[PDB]
mmCIF file of C-alpha atoms and ligand atoms in Angstrom:
data_model
loop_
_atom_site.group_PDB
_atom_site.id
_atom_site.type_symbol
_atom_site.label_atom_id
_atom_site.label_comp_id
_atom_site.label_asym_id
_atom_site.label_seq_id
_atom_site.Cartn_x
_atom_site.Cartn_y
_atom_site.Cartn_z
ATOM 1 C CA UNK A 19 -10.556 12.168 19.542
ATOM 2 C CA UNK A 20 -13.171 11.298 22.311
ATOM 3 C CA UNK A 21 -14.948 8.609 20.200
ATOM 4 C CA UNK A 22 -13.369 5.980 17.821
ATOM 5 C CA UNK A 23 -13.978 3.287 15.956
ATOM 6 C CA UNK A 24 -12.850 0.032 17.503
ATOM 7 C CA UNK A 25 -10.283 -1.884 15.479
ATOM 8 C CA UNK A 26 -10.971 -5.743 16.241
ATOM 9 C CA UNK A 27 -7.247 -6.409 15.258
ATOM 10 C CA UNK A 28 -6.261 -4.276 18.156
ATOM 11 C CA UNK A 29 -8.616 -6.030 21.030
ATOM 12 C CA UNK A 30 -6.991 -8.815 23.045
ATOM 13 C CA UNK A 31 -6.954 -12.312 22.092
ATOM 14 C CA UNK A 32 -9.733 -14.052 23.977
ATOM 15 C CA UNK A 33 -8.459 -17.162 25.728
ATOM 16 C CA UNK A 34 -12.000 -18.239 25.681
ATOM 17 C CA UNK A 35 -10.731 -19.750 22.408
ATOM 18 C CA UNK A 36 -7.760 -21.644 23.694
ATOM 19 C CA UNK A 37 -7.569 -25.508 23.064
ATOM 20 C CA UNK A 38 -4.794 -27.658 23.773
ATOM 21 C CA UNK A 39 -2.931 -28.703 20.745
ATOM 22 C CA UNK A 40 -2.489 -32.359 22.083
ATOM 23 C CA UNK A 41 -6.035 -33.376 21.668
ATOM 24 C CA UNK A 42 -5.935 -32.924 17.964
ATOM 25 C CA UNK A 43 -4.907 -35.821 15.229
ATOM 26 C CA UNK A 44 -4.017 -33.807 12.211
ATOM 27 C CA UNK A 45 -5.145 -35.761 8.856
ATOM 28 C CA UNK A 46 -5.522 -34.654 5.166
ATOM 29 C CA UNK A 47 -4.041 -31.407 3.728
ATOM 30 C CA UNK A 48 -7.226 -29.535 2.548
ATOM 31 C CA UNK A 49 -5.011 -26.423 1.115
ATOM 32 C CA UNK A 50 -1.489 -24.839 1.220
ATOM 33 C CA UNK A 51 -0.198 -21.263 0.793
ATOM 34 C CA UNK A 52 2.737 -19.383 1.843
ATOM 35 C CA UNK A 53 1.828 -19.225 5.440
ATOM 36 C CA UNK A 54 1.419 -23.016 5.641
ATOM 37 C CA UNK A 55 -1.760 -25.370 5.305
ATOM 38 C CA UNK A 56 -4.880 -26.163 6.315
ATOM 39 C CA UNK A 57 -5.526 -29.559 7.418
ATOM 40 C CA UNK A 58 -8.627 -31.865 8.534
ATOM 41 C CA UNK A 59 -7.975 -33.159 12.229
ATOM 42 C CA UNK A 60 -9.946 -34.804 14.625
ATOM 43 C CA UNK A 61 -10.323 -32.749 17.925
ATOM 44 C CA UNK A 62 -10.885 -34.698 21.198
ATOM 45 C CA UNK A 63 -13.112 -33.223 23.704
ATOM 46 C CA UNK A 64 -13.449 -30.104 22.114
ATOM 47 C CA UNK A 65 -17.150 -29.098 22.522
ATOM 48 C CA UNK A 66 -18.478 -32.455 24.576
ATOM 49 C CA UNK A 67 -15.646 -33.324 26.952
ATOM 50 C CA UNK A 68 -16.081 -36.891 25.836
ATOM 51 C CA UNK A 69 -16.425 -36.836 22.160
ATOM 52 C CA UNK A 70 -14.077 -36.319 19.382
ATOM 53 C CA UNK A 71 -15.055 -34.061 16.004
ATOM 54 C CA UNK A 72 -13.871 -33.433 12.735
ATOM 55 C CA UNK A 73 -12.450 -30.044 12.644
ATOM 56 C CA UNK A 74 -10.216 -27.794 10.069
ATOM 57 C CA UNK A 75 -6.927 -26.591 11.707
ATOM 58 C CA UNK A 76 -5.294 -23.500 9.776
ATOM 59 C CA UNK A 77 -1.206 -23.408 10.791
ATOM 60 C CA UNK A 78 1.642 -21.284 10.059
ATOM 61 C CA UNK A 79 4.797 -23.359 9.324
ATOM 62 C CA UNK A 80 7.651 -22.893 11.639
ATOM 63 C CA UNK A 81 9.517 -20.771 9.118
ATOM 64 C CA UNK A 82 6.835 -18.354 8.773
ATOM 65 C CA UNK A 83 7.769 -14.548 9.033
ATOM 66 C CA UNK A 84 6.549 -11.792 10.858
ATOM 67 C CA UNK A 85 4.094 -10.690 8.105
ATOM 68 C CA UNK A 86 2.711 -14.403 8.020
ATOM 69 C CA UNK A 87 2.351 -14.698 11.819
ATOM 70 C CA UNK A 88 0.624 -11.581 12.597
ATOM 71 C CA UNK A 89 -1.654 -11.964 9.439
ATOM 72 C CA UNK A 90 -3.035 -15.266 10.980
ATOM 73 C CA UNK A 91 -3.678 -13.744 14.758
ATOM 74 C CA UNK A 92 -5.463 -10.755 12.915
ATOM 75 C CA UNK A 93 -7.616 -13.219 11.009
ATOM 76 C CA UNK A 94 -8.233 -15.068 14.182
ATOM 77 C CA UNK A 95 -9.146 -11.627 15.940
ATOM 78 C CA UNK A 96 -11.515 -10.648 12.892
ATOM 79 C CA UNK A 97 -13.430 -14.128 13.388
ATOM 80 C CA UNK A 98 -13.515 -13.481 17.009
ATOM 81 C CA UNK A 99 -15.398 -10.096 16.068
ATOM 82 C CA UNK A 100 -17.668 -11.489 13.610
ATOM 83 C CA UNK A 101 -19.195 -13.882 15.940
ATOM 84 C CA UNK A 102 -21.149 -16.929 14.765
ATOM 85 C CA UNK A 103 -23.156 -17.190 11.608
ATOM 86 C CA UNK A 104 -24.567 -20.271 9.527
ATOM 87 C CA UNK A 105 -23.204 -19.112 6.397
ATOM 88 C CA UNK A 106 -19.623 -18.643 7.504
ATOM 89 C CA UNK A 107 -16.876 -21.346 8.304
ATOM 90 C CA UNK A 108 -17.057 -20.519 12.025
ATOM 91 C CA UNK A 109 -14.212 -20.112 14.441
ATOM 92 C CA UNK A 110 -14.135 -23.071 17.048
ATOM 93 C CA UNK A 111 -10.754 -22.818 18.904
ATOM 94 C CA UNK A 112 -7.204 -21.626 18.540
ATOM 95 C CA UNK A 113 -3.845 -22.840 19.968
ATOM 96 C CA UNK A 114 -1.648 -19.866 20.746
ATOM 97 C CA UNK A 115 1.412 -21.305 22.637
ATOM 98 C CA UNK A 116 3.110 -24.990 22.261
ATOM 99 C CA UNK A 117 3.993 -24.631 18.712
ATOM 100 C CA UNK A 118 3.076 -22.617 15.688
ATOM 101 C CA UNK A 119 -0.246 -20.777 15.877
ATOM 102 C CA UNK A 120 -3.214 -22.975 15.164
ATOM 103 C CA UNK A 121 -6.866 -21.669 14.231
ATOM 104 C CA UNK A 122 -9.522 -24.126 14.513
ATOM 105 C CA UNK A 123 -12.695 -23.855 12.338
ATOM 106 C CA UNK A 124 -15.600 -25.767 11.318
ATOM 107 C CA UNK A 125 -15.020 -28.617 8.592
ATOM 108 C CA UNK A 126 -17.458 -28.790 5.601
ATOM 109 C CA UNK A 127 -17.569 -32.230 4.438
ATOM 110 C CA UNK A 128 -18.483 -31.674 0.802
ATOM 111 C CA UNK A 129 -15.375 -29.394 0.198
ATOM 112 C CA UNK A 130 -15.541 -26.390 -2.045
ATOM 113 C CA UNK A 131 -18.466 -25.555 -4.184
ATOM 114 C CA UNK A 132 -16.310 -25.012 -7.271
ATOM 115 C CA UNK A 133 -15.199 -28.798 -7.703
ATOM 116 C CA UNK A 134 -18.487 -29.695 -6.406
ATOM 117 C CA UNK A 135 -20.627 -28.150 -9.052
ATOM 118 C CA UNK A 136 -17.785 -29.532 -11.433
ATOM 119 C CA UNK A 137 -18.643 -33.222 -10.079
ATOM 120 C CA UNK A 138 -22.108 -32.816 -10.434
ATOM 121 C CA UNK A 139 -21.977 -31.085 -13.966
ATOM 122 C CA UNK A 140 -22.724 -34.286 -15.974
ATOM 123 C CA UNK A 141 -25.697 -35.166 -13.872
ATOM 124 C CA UNK A 142 -27.267 -31.802 -13.517
ATOM 125 C CA UNK A 143 -30.793 -31.252 -14.400
ATOM 126 C CA UNK A 144 -32.842 -28.091 -14.060
ATOM 127 C CA UNK A 157 -28.100 -31.242 -8.697
ATOM 128 C CA UNK A 158 -31.035 -29.299 -9.802
ATOM 129 C CA UNK A 159 -31.828 -25.207 -10.112
ATOM 130 C CA UNK A 160 -33.538 -25.060 -6.849
ATOM 131 C CA UNK A 161 -29.995 -25.846 -5.820
ATOM 132 C CA UNK A 162 -28.439 -23.124 -7.254
ATOM 133 C CA UNK A 163 -30.962 -20.520 -6.159
ATOM 134 C CA UNK A 164 -30.519 -21.688 -2.465
ATOM 135 C CA UNK A 165 -26.545 -21.725 -3.056
ATOM 136 C CA UNK A 166 -27.020 -17.764 -4.335
ATOM 137 C CA UNK A 167 -29.245 -16.953 -1.438
ATOM 138 C CA UNK A 168 -27.052 -18.179 1.353
ATOM 139 C CA UNK A 169 -23.924 -16.871 0.308
ATOM 140 C CA UNK A 170 -25.689 -13.521 -0.163
ATOM 141 C CA UNK A 171 -26.827 -13.895 3.368
ATOM 142 C CA UNK A 172 -23.357 -14.700 4.204
ATOM 143 C CA UNK A 173 -21.980 -11.770 2.759
ATOM 144 C CA UNK A 174 -24.630 -9.312 3.906
ATOM 145 C CA UNK A 175 -23.684 -10.526 7.596
ATOM 146 C CA UNK A 176 -20.122 -9.386 6.782
ATOM 147 C CA UNK A 177 -21.113 -6.108 5.480
ATOM 148 C CA UNK A 178 -23.283 -5.528 8.284
ATOM 149 C CA UNK A 179 -20.184 -5.783 10.578
ATOM 150 C CA UNK A 180 -18.204 -3.468 8.510
ATOM 151 C CA UNK A 181 -16.055 -6.072 7.031
ATOM 152 C CA UNK A 182 -14.765 -7.094 3.470
ATOM 153 C CA UNK A 183 -13.654 -10.640 2.498
ATOM 154 C CA UNK A 184 -11.666 -9.532 -0.868
ATOM 155 C CA UNK A 185 -11.623 -13.221 -2.359
ATOM 156 C CA UNK A 186 -15.401 -14.184 -2.708
ATOM 157 C CA UNK A 187 -15.214 -16.775 -5.371
ATOM 158 C CA UNK A 188 -16.599 -20.368 -5.669
ATOM 159 C CA UNK A 189 -13.272 -21.974 -4.557
ATOM 160 C CA UNK A 190 -14.140 -20.019 -1.352
ATOM 161 C CA UNK A 191 -17.594 -21.395 -0.738
ATOM 162 C CA UNK A 192 -17.811 -24.809 1.184
ATOM 163 C CA UNK A 193 -20.553 -27.054 1.432
ATOM 164 C CA UNK A 194 -21.754 -29.137 4.513
ATOM 165 C CA UNK A 195 -24.548 -31.217 5.502
ATOM 166 C CA UNK A 196 -27.989 -30.014 4.932
ATOM 167 C CA UNK A 197 -26.673 -28.088 1.501
ATOM 168 C CA UNK A 198 -25.553 -25.237 3.818
ATOM 169 C CA UNK A 199 -22.540 -23.098 1.867
ATOM 170 C CA UNK A 200 -20.440 -21.666 4.073
ATOM 171 C CA UNK A 201 -17.844 -18.454 3.114
ATOM 172 C CA UNK A 202 -14.231 -19.510 3.971
ATOM 173 C CA UNK A 203 -10.884 -18.269 3.997
ATOM 174 C CA UNK A 204 -10.563 -14.879 5.953
ATOM 175 C CA UNK A 205 -7.085 -14.206 5.611
ATOM 176 C CA UNK A 206 -7.623 -10.983 3.629
ATOM 177 C CA UNK A 207 -10.785 -9.792 5.280
ATOM 178 C CA UNK A 208 -10.744 -6.650 6.712
ATOM 179 C CA UNK A 209 -12.785 -4.367 8.837
ATOM 180 C CA UNK A 210 -12.885 -0.981 6.826
ATOM 181 C CA UNK A 211 -13.423 1.077 10.070
ATOM 182 C CA UNK A 212 -13.198 5.017 9.421
ATOM 183 C CA UNK A 213 -12.076 4.457 5.921
ATOM 184 C CA UNK A 214 -14.996 3.205 4.023
ATOM 185 C CA UNK A 215 -12.368 1.639 1.803
ATOM 186 C CA UNK A 216 -9.021 -0.413 2.050
ATOM 187 C CA UNK A 217 -6.343 0.339 -0.202
ATOM 188 C CA UNK A 218 -4.006 -2.759 -0.396
ATOM 189 C CA UNK A 219 -0.519 -2.504 0.223
ATOM 190 C CA UNK A 220 0.468 -5.975 -0.569
ATOM 191 C CA UNK A 221 2.298 -7.288 -3.641
ATOM 192 C CA UNK A 222 0.733 -10.764 -3.546
ATOM 193 C CA UNK A 223 -0.655 -12.907 -6.816
ATOM 194 C CA UNK A 224 -4.288 -11.677 -7.061
ATOM 195 C CA UNK A 225 -7.766 -13.169 -8.418
ATOM 196 C CA UNK A 226 -7.909 -10.832 -10.971
ATOM 197 C CA UNK A 227 -10.949 -12.260 -12.992
ATOM 198 C CA UNK A 228 -13.115 -11.787 -9.616
ATOM 199 C CA UNK A 229 -11.772 -8.031 -9.178
ATOM 200 C CA UNK A 230 -13.696 -4.731 -9.502
ATOM 201 C CA UNK A 231 -11.770 -2.597 -12.148
ATOM 202 C CA UNK A 232 -11.352 0.119 -9.185
ATOM 203 C CA UNK A 233 -9.613 -2.822 -7.388
ATOM 204 C CA UNK A 234 -7.330 -3.778 -10.242
ATOM 205 C CA UNK A 235 -6.654 -0.403 -11.325
ATOM 206 C CA UNK A 236 -6.301 1.582 -8.207
ATOM 207 C CA UNK A 237 -6.034 -1.122 -5.378
ATOM 208 C CA UNK A 238 -9.245 0.053 -3.546
ATOM 209 C CA UNK A 239 -11.489 -2.398 -2.115
ATOM 210 C CA UNK A 240 -14.933 -1.832 -0.606
ATOM 211 C CA UNK A 241 -18.321 -3.293 -0.060
ATOM 212 C CA UNK A 242 -19.083 -2.548 -3.607
ATOM 213 C CA UNK A 243 -15.969 -4.475 -5.097
ATOM 214 C CA UNK A 244 -17.028 -7.721 -2.596
ATOM 215 C CA UNK A 245 -20.510 -7.118 -4.536
ATOM 216 C CA UNK A 246 -18.659 -7.368 -8.227
ATOM 217 C CA UNK A 247 -17.022 -10.560 -7.128
ATOM 218 C CA UNK A 248 -20.343 -11.822 -6.043
ATOM 219 C CA UNK A 249 -21.530 -11.362 -9.492
ATOM 220 C CA UNK A 250 -18.613 -13.262 -10.671
ATOM 221 C CA UNK A 251 -19.604 -16.009 -7.971
ATOM 222 C CA UNK A 252 -23.065 -16.186 -9.512
ATOM 223 C CA UNK A 253 -21.815 -16.972 -12.970
ATOM 224 C CA UNK A 254 -19.469 -19.477 -11.980
ATOM 225 C CA UNK A 255 -22.737 -21.004 -10.037
ATOM 226 C CA UNK A 256 -25.089 -20.994 -12.867
ATOM 227 C CA UNK A 257 -22.795 -22.296 -15.558
ATOM 228 C CA UNK A 258 -21.977 -25.396 -13.341
ATOM 229 C CA UNK A 259 -18.320 -24.373 -12.458
ATOM 230 C CA UNK A 260 -17.122 -22.885 -15.740
ATOM 231 C CA UNK A 261 -13.988 -20.683 -15.381
ATOM 232 C CA UNK A 262 -14.964 -17.067 -15.898
ATOM 233 C CA UNK A 263 -14.069 -15.097 -19.154
ATOM 234 C CA UNK A 264 -13.410 -18.352 -21.290
ATOM 235 C CA UNK A 265 -10.693 -17.695 -24.054
ATOM 236 C CA UNK A 266 -9.478 -14.791 -22.251
ATOM 237 C CA UNK A 267 -6.185 -14.974 -20.691
ATOM 238 C CA UNK A 268 -5.297 -11.908 -18.036
ATOM 239 C CA UNK A 269 -3.149 -9.718 -20.444
ATOM 240 C CA UNK A 270 -3.319 -6.321 -21.718
ATOM 241 C CA UNK A 271 -6.388 -6.927 -23.679
ATOM 242 C CA UNK A 272 -8.274 -8.333 -20.872
ATOM 243 C CA UNK A 273 -7.936 -5.011 -18.884
ATOM 244 C CA UNK A 274 -8.682 -2.906 -21.691
ATOM 245 C CA UNK A 275 -11.919 -4.983 -22.360
ATOM 246 C CA UNK A 276 -12.937 -4.869 -18.935
ATOM 247 C CA UNK A 277 -12.272 -1.137 -18.672
ATOM 248 C CA UNK A 278 -14.704 -0.369 -21.727
ATOM 249 C CA UNK A 279 -17.188 -2.458 -20.418
ATOM 250 C CA UNK A 280 -17.169 -5.784 -21.767
ATOM 251 C CA UNK A 281 -18.855 -8.051 -19.762
ATOM 252 C CA UNK A 282 -19.744 -11.994 -19.809
ATOM 253 C CA UNK A 283 -22.852 -13.208 -21.140
ATOM 254 C CA UNK A 284 -25.696 -15.227 -19.425
ATOM 255 C CA UNK A 285 -25.013 -18.734 -18.511
ATOM 256 C CA UNK A 286 -26.875 -21.530 -20.008
ATOM 257 C CA UNK A 287 -28.675 -22.193 -16.583
ATOM 258 C CA UNK A 288 -29.332 -18.698 -15.357
ATOM 259 C CA UNK A 289 -32.671 -17.308 -14.786
ATOM 260 C CA UNK A 290 -33.406 -14.041 -16.232
ATOM 261 C CA UNK A 291 -33.599 -12.255 -12.806
ATOM 262 C CA UNK A 292 -30.381 -14.147 -11.704
ATOM 263 C CA UNK A 293 -28.270 -12.720 -14.717
ATOM 264 C CA UNK A 294 -29.880 -9.162 -14.044
ATOM 265 C CA UNK A 295 -28.339 -9.345 -10.635
ATOM 266 C CA UNK A 296 -25.053 -10.167 -12.370
ATOM 267 C CA UNK A 297 -25.302 -7.308 -14.531
ATOM 268 C CA UNK A 298 -25.892 -4.628 -11.521
ATOM 269 C CA UNK A 299 -23.008 -5.853 -9.623
ATOM 270 C CA UNK A 300 -20.723 -5.732 -12.716
ATOM 271 C CA UNK A 301 -21.514 -1.738 -13.057
ATOM 272 C CA UNK A 302 -18.270 0.399 -13.774
ATOM 273 C CA UNK A 303 -19.983 2.575 -11.306
ATOM 274 C CA UNK A 304 -19.479 1.349 -7.450
ATOM 275 C CA UNK A 305 -22.244 3.231 -6.567
ATOM 276 C CA UNK A 306 -24.890 1.829 -8.733
ATOM 277 C CA UNK A 307 -24.145 -1.953 -7.286
ATOM 278 C CA UNK A 308 -26.685 -3.371 -5.610
ATOM 279 C CA UNK A 309 -25.727 -3.920 -1.789
ATOM 280 C CA UNK A 310 -25.785 -7.703 -0.583
ATOM 281 C CA UNK A 311 -29.047 -6.541 1.580
ATOM 282 C CA UNK A 312 -30.578 -5.840 -1.656
ATOM 283 C CA UNK A 313 -29.485 -8.753 -3.453
ATOM 284 C CA UNK A 314 -31.178 -11.155 -0.210
ATOM 285 C CA UNK A 315 -34.345 -9.522 -0.801
ATOM 286 C CA UNK A 316 -34.275 -9.943 -4.689
ATOM 287 C CA UNK A 317 -33.243 -13.668 -4.175
ATOM 288 C CA UNK A 318 -35.845 -13.933 -1.580
ATOM 289 C CA UNK A 319 -38.791 -12.849 -4.019
ATOM 290 C CA UNK A 320 -37.290 -15.265 -6.541
ATOM 291 C CA UNK A 321 -37.271 -18.178 -4.113
ATOM 292 C CA UNK A 322 -41.061 -17.400 -3.357
ATOM 293 C CA UNK A 323 -41.978 -17.245 -6.657
HETATM 294 C C1 98A B 401 -11.766 -32.272 -1.117
HETATM 295 N N1 98A B 401 -12.497 -31.792 0.411
HETATM 296 C C2 98A B 401 -11.751 -30.670 0.866
HETATM 297 C C3 98A B 401 -12.557 -30.167 1.904
HETATM 298 C C4 98A B 401 -12.489 -29.147 2.990
HETATM 299 C C5 98A B 401 -11.917 -27.566 2.906
HETATM 300 C C6 98A B 401 -12.109 -26.834 4.154
HETATM 301 C C7 98A B 401 -11.677 -25.894 4.425
HETATM 302 N N2 98A B 401 -10.762 -24.896 3.620
HETATM 303 C C8 98A B 401 -10.733 -23.374 4.432
HETATM 304 C C9 98A B 401 -9.787 -22.920 3.218
HETATM 305 N N3 98A B 401 -8.529 -23.421 2.851
HETATM 306 C C10 98A B 401 -7.322 -22.625 2.295
HETATM 307 N N4 98A B 401 -6.486 -23.195 1.473
HETATM 308 C C11 98A B 401 -5.616 -22.492 1.242
HETATM 309 C C12 98A B 401 -5.281 -21.267 1.960
HETATM 310 C C13 98A B 401 -6.505 -20.680 2.927
HETATM 311 N N5 98A B 401 -7.180 -21.416 3.097
HETATM 312 C C14 98A B 401 -8.468 -24.945 2.474
HETATM 313 C C15 98A B 401 -9.992 -25.291 2.595
HETATM 314 N N6 98A B 401 -12.100 -25.103 5.568
HETATM 315 C C16 98A B 401 -13.307 -26.197 6.338
HETATM 316 N N7 98A B 401 -13.745 -27.407 5.925
HETATM 317 N N8 98A B 401 -13.012 -28.109 4.759
HETATM 318 C C17 98A B 401 -13.495 -28.820 4.052
HETATM 319 C C18 98A B 401 -13.609 -31.619 2.252
HETATM 320 N N9 98A B 401 -13.471 -32.230 1.041
#
């Protein structure tokens, strides 16, 4: 009782982040949910006093219920605790009065990697394989950073990797990210729609989320990447047969453009035994070896 894990969501909001909402000009909607939406916006004087910059702004709709309002604040506090990293969509500011809560993050000008791969699919040549290895490395580095902070993301997928200048990929959407603190896992108590084809079996069957279940989803991400944006498990709807096959050990085959060593990572990320999956640290070092060779 004299020592405890500091819950980042119990910490005070740090007003160092506060930014006046009247200096934001909202534009295109980038995504929407039951919480509200994310929009592109211009922020006047956010980093430099006399300069405008493009940001993304996540906003609660005025009708948001208590469940969604405190979820957005919790997300803000998790991002504040995680700190800056090159391979995540970083927190830049927040607006916590004058209207609904707003969370201001970096804007990634090339949008999500799933649509990017689908746009570039027709003109891909072995967009090149070098780009795909880079994206695989950068996402592993982002996730290794999250795991090093005792956090899990719980919706890792190509649709939640964004691309910005310099071919830099950033992990986005931390609405479900959790510090697992003392429990070493997270049992989800919600009742929302779930990304079934990206989930580890123990998450589907027992609602348990761990470092190892994030690694399962990374394996699925890799399959999306090297198939140039195909939907996973083609020709298999989510139904009784899907769950039985996954439980019995069915796995996707190697994508057309995956190097053998990258499919090897995929297969280990999809081990039925969570303990036999690699860590993100191990994945980074493996892909590092592949790049240098
Ligand atoms: C066509 N195009 C789209 C972009 C784009 C999208 C984002 C972006 N998000 C964060 C996650 N989002 C979200 N959606 C629903 C629920 C929760 N989160 C929406 C997307 N964040 C930062 N930059 N950025 C740039 C550029 N071109």
